[PDB]
């Protein structure tokens, strides 16, 4: 499942 606090930026 998605962690909303994880890196939201491109990579």
């Amino acid at each position, epitope marked *: 499942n998605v962690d*909303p*606090n*994880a890196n*939201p*930026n*491109v990579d």
Partner: antibody
């Protein structure tokens, strides 16, 4: 150097809608997720919403869920906060914010770039 | 939500002194803790992230420490430019802020 630039604030009647926008200067905004953080006159900071770099994941504070909608146009490189059914308690300065830097060994990113803020005044 | 509690509400300081600001979390946030400075009419400015890492451009007299739910911002040899409101923020579980400590001039 690097800045975030917002626009769209103003006086709006209770229950009406208002759309904020955010752009980057000195970097490409679409490389980053984008937050909105608001500050009401005389009080502290309140996180509002977040949109993933590619516009997939969107997240909202409980206080605005179902009323606010976040979106982005990665062609123009602009992030939008669509605010509907506004109330007096949404009166605040709204900051566009970049989560641009992470501590060593972390994949969690702190809010390193803040816009100047656009003022939203909900009033009749 | 995770509640961030700062103390004292106001810290009265003279230039040249050491300021010690406290930030408590209602549960562990690991090291995902940031400190911000804010002056009237201006946006917050990131000082510290990862609990102890100083952001680029910030003078070395600012340092963060702590872990879990207990954090401290130390301003050594305070300068007149440092009178401001300081916020802590956890970014471990959503995003929540303390209510700020005002550092004012003592007299």
């Amino acid at each position: 150097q690097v800045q975030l630039v917002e626009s769209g604030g103003g006086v709006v009647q209770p229950g009406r809608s208002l759309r904020l926008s955010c752009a980057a200067s000195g970097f490409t905004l679409s490389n980053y997720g984008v937050h909105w953080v608001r500050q009401a006159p005389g009080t502290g900071l309140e996180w509002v919403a977040l949109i993933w770099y590619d516009g997939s994941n969107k997240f909202y504070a409980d206080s605005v869920k179902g009323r606010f909608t976040i979106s982005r146009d990665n062609s123009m490189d602009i992030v939008y906060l669509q605010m509907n059914n506004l109330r007096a308690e949404d009166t605040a300065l709204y900051y566009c914010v970049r989560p641009g830097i992470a501590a060593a060994g972390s994949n969690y990113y702190a809010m390193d770039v803040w816009g100047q803020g656009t003022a939203v005044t909900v009033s009749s | 939500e995770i509640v961030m509690t700062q103390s004292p509400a106001t810290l009265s300081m003279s230039p040249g002194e050491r300021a010690t600001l406290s930030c408590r979390a209602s549960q562990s946030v690991g090291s995902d803790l940031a400190w911000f400075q804010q002056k009237p009419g201006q946006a917050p400015r990131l000082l510290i992230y990862g609990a102890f890492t100083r952001a680029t451009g910030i003078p070395a007299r600012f340092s963060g420490s702590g872990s879990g739910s207990e954090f401290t911002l130390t301003i050594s040899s305070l300068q007149s430019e440092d009178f401001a409101v300081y916020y802590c923020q956890q970014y471990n579980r959503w995003w929540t802020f303390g209510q700020g400590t005002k550092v004012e001039m003592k007299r």
